[PDB]
Amino acid sequence: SVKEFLAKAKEDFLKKWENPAQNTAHLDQFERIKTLGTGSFGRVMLVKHMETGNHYAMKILDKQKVVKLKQIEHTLNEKRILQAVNFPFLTKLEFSFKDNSNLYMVMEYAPGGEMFSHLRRIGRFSEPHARFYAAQIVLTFEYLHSLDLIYRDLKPENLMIDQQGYIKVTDFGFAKRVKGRTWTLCGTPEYLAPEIILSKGYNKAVDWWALGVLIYEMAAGYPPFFADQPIQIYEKIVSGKVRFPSHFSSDLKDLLRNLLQVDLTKRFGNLKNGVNDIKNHKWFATTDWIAIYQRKVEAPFIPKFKGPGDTSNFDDYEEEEIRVSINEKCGKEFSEF
């Protein structure tokens, strides 16, 4: 059963969590092919592992930039968590290592590109299309939350599509293993739960709020709360008012009212019944949860796949050197990495 699967999953996770894998490859074991996208203290590249000819996504973080942005502990979280998890809709680390200048995390490559790109281009997804993706997020969060992990950055930008049209939740920069409340102000403005904005201690309920935002955005083509400046967005989020497009089904609107619920005693996912309030909602009535986990459902969108190492579903970014200083930077800060 679910409870049995999750218990065994936790036993597997805890062993790796308590004894993390370290220094399991080196940069010269890979050929760098192309930049798939960038962040403030790093980038993700398509690389080929020369030993096997396997293609991977390689996240390269500049240690000095991580330090400057005060993301040391969050980065240690990311690596420690991703080396320890294993789930169909996440990319665990296949390898990790560091050198004088950088931190490296190597993960399965998803060639379908970002959900963001497809969503913006197509405009919006149909409810069945949005439900297919939402189901995979619901199961991922059930998995993560059972391990006491909060994800804290759900958005289309972080959801990659694989060759079969299924999704991978990527970028665990703000993921954290916490049993109680936590306080860090982090996430993306449009996706922040009101608890975060109002500087309360918060818990995994923020991920279920974020799911409400994602489902809304996928179905409408725009998010429930937007403006030109974040402060205007925060005002809208706290106010306790959302409007649904006329094409939203009755079922969809009701699910969203229960996900985008400022009252934590009423928010779906955070009640006595837990995730099953979501799984057994009418909007998910046609969802076969086991078939989705097993990846037996036919995807409503399958991406263009011209071959191995194809990058056509990603945008182009200016390619820059991976420079490795002759002096070790930030040795003590990232010793456990």
């Binding site: 996208g37 403030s40 942005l69 005060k70 993301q71 963001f116 913006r120 405009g123 950055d153 958005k155 930008e157 920069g173 703000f174 860090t184 102000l185 982090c186 996430g187 993306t188 403005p189 449009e190 922040l192 409408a220 083509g221 725009y222 937007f226 403006a227 030109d228 974040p230 409007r243 497009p245």
Partner: peptide, 20 residues
């Protein structure tokens, strides 16, 4: 339309995370 207001806004591209 709300669609038109969205597309004319400055938040249709990839959105950056915030942090303290």
């Amino acid at each position: 339309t709300t669609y038109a207001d969205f597309i004319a806004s400055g938040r249709t591209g990839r959105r950056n995370a915030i942090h303290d």
